[PDB]
Structures are given as structure tokens and as C-alpha cells.
């Protein structure tokens, strides 16, 4: 069969993945979308603020960077939505279905924008 390896087949690694929102079955797709969106949205603000074109402005740097992070989350939400449209047109987990993914994309937008807003509040 496939080449066995500790990275591919280890107990500690398997348990960690099984607890991630993507693999945690039994949770509504919308809730998983919010949990995933919040984590990525919070991180997405970092690089824009520190290395953006308006990084050296004292107060505008925080606003401009976070506002660009919010924009990228919006674009990503569109990518999630159209992916579901193309992939699911006609199985065990509700997420991998036309109904499930549409809820998942909506949750990501709500969670992602909340994370970007929450990141801004931390700064000011």
C-alpha cells in the first residue's frame, strides 16, 4: 500500500488534526465556518499593517492595514462560495454538499470580518 511514515501515520498527529474545525464532525457547517474564519481573519491583519504602503503613518497605518485585511476576507469568501457551486452540483459529512458549503462560506465571511474587526480593537 501507501508508504507508511510517522508523519502520515502517527497517534499524536492524528489526534491534533481530529480536533481542528475542518475535521471536527458533528458541528454545523455554519459554526465551523465561523470558527475557521475568525482564526484566519485575526491573523490576516498582521502583515498588511506592518508592511503596507501606509505603514509609517502613525495612526492611518492601523486603519488602512485592517481595512485591506477586511477586503481580502471578502474576496476569499467569494472564492469559497463559487467553489461550492462548481464542486457540489448533484458525502458522509454535511459540509461536503451544496447546502453545507453555502452555509460554510457564509460563516467564513461573518467570522473572518469579525476577526479582522477584533484584531483592530486590540490595537486601539
Amino acid at each position: 500500500g501507501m508508504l507508511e511514515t510517522p508523519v502520515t501515520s502517527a497517534p499524536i498527529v492524528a489526534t491534533y488534526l481530529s480536533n481542528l474545525p475542518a475535521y471536527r464532525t458533528g458541528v454545523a457547517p455554519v459554526l465551523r465556518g465561523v470558527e475557521i474564519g475568525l482564526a484566519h481573519g485575526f491573523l490576516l491583519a498582521g502583515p498588511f499593517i506592518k508592511l503596507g504602503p501606509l505603514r509609517n503613518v502613525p495612526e492611518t497605518a492601523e486603519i488602512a492595514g485592517s481595512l485591506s485585511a477586511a477586503g481580502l476576507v471578502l474576496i476569499l469568501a467569494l472564492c469559497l462560495s463559487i467553489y461550492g457551486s462548481a464542486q457540489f452540483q448533484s458525502a458522509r459529512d454535511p459540509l461536503f454538499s451544496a447546502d453545507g458549503w453555502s452555509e460554510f462560506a457564509a460563516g467564513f465571511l461573518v467570522g473572518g470580518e469579525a476577526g479582522v474587526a477584533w484584531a483592530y480593537v486590540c490595537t486601539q
Binding site: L78, S81, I82, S85, A86, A98, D99, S102, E103
Partner: protein, 184 residues
């Protein structure tokens, strides 16, 4: 047991719950005619769709700092005078609406120009239909609030909210309604 607008109310016969946003709220029995119901259902969306854009526009214009009030904007002067705005609007807006009706008759669904349904991104689903009307109904009710609050308060929507936020118990409808001459 589908929820109803009034707890303990049995939905009437003419409301079967099929249409998106159905809650059994037809006390006056207007939708009892199937032919009229199909027209009304589409008519509800378009009134709501215009409302949703209008509410966003009023809020967008206010937040961005557009100084003229959303009700005084008509009197304002632009590069193109009213001598040309109305003729263009009638010609352009007529074509969109004339073709909208033609498509609705043939297919029965909403659309844009020659696209019926107009769903480029393939987001259409039974869930999205409910989300559309409920946001649409909210905008319709919200817009009337903008119009009524303009008369009572003569203030922009957010300005009214900020005034309400400033003093919660004060700046309520009682102040503006009772002290109407002052706010005018």
C-alpha cells in the same frame, strides 16, 4: 410546526409555506388569488430590492460625508442639469423594466436584461431566497423610518441614532414629537 407571525395561528389555506419568507402573515387575504400571488411575490422583491439599495445609499451618502441631506439632494445642482437627467433616466430605465417584464412573463423568475435568472455566480438556493426577502423586508421598513424620522426630527439616520446614543432616555420620539417646533 412552521413558525407563524402570530403564535398559535394556523396559516391560511392560500399560504402553503412554499414561497421564500412565508410566515402565514396574510390577515387581509390578499394572496388568495394564485394569479395575483405570483405577481405580488415578484412585486415584493422588486420593492424590497429598490429599498435595500436606497437604504444603503442613504447610509452610504451620510457616512461618507455627503453634506446635502438625503431629501434635499434633488434640489442640488450637478454638472448635468435636470434638463438632461430625466430624458436619459426615462429612456434607460424604461428599457431595463420593459425587458424585465418580458422575461418574467416567459419564465416567471427575476432577471436582468436577457438573463432569467440573473445568477452569474451560481449563488441561488432556497436558503438565499429567504435571506433576500428578509433583508429586503427589513430595508423596506427601515426606509420608511428614514422618511418619517426626517419629518419628526429633520435629521439624518445616523445622526438620529447618534443622538439616541448620546442620551438614551432623551432624544427619543417623545422629545421630537412633543417639541416639534423646536426641531423644525
Amino acid at each position: 410546526a412552521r413558525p407563524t407571525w402570530l403564535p398559535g395561528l394556523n396559516p391560511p389555506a392560500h399560504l402553503k409555506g412554499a414561497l421564500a419568507g412565508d410566515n402565514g402573515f396574510d390577515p387581509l387575504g390578499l394572496g388568495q388569488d394564485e394569479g395575483r400571488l405570483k405577481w405580488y411575490a415578484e412585486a415584493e422583491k422588486t420593492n424590497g430590492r429598490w429599498a435595500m439599495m436606497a437604504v444603503a445609499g442613504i447610509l452610504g451618502q451620510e457616512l461618507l460625508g455627503v453634506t446635502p441631506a438625503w431629501w434635499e439632494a434633488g434640489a442640488k445642482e450637478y454638472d448635468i442639469p435636470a434638463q438632461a437627467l430625466t430624458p436619459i433616466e426615462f429612456i434607460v430605465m424604461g428599457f431595463l423594466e420593459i425587458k424585465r417584464y418580458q422575461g418574467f412573463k416567459q419564465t416567471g423568475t427575476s432577471g436582468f436584461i436577457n438573463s432569467f435568472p440573473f445568477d452569474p455566480a451560481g449563488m441561488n438556493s432556497p436558503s438565499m431566497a429567504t435571506k433576500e426577502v428578509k433583508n429586503g423586508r427589513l430595508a423596506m421598513v427601515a426606509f420608511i423610518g428614514f422618511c418619517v424620522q426626517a419629518l419628526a426630527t429633520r435629521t439624518q439616520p445616523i445622526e438620529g441614532l447618534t443622538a439616541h446614543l448620546a442620551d438614551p432616555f432623551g432624544k427619543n420620539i417623545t422629545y421630537y414629537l412633543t417639541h416639534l417646533p423646536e426641531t423644525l
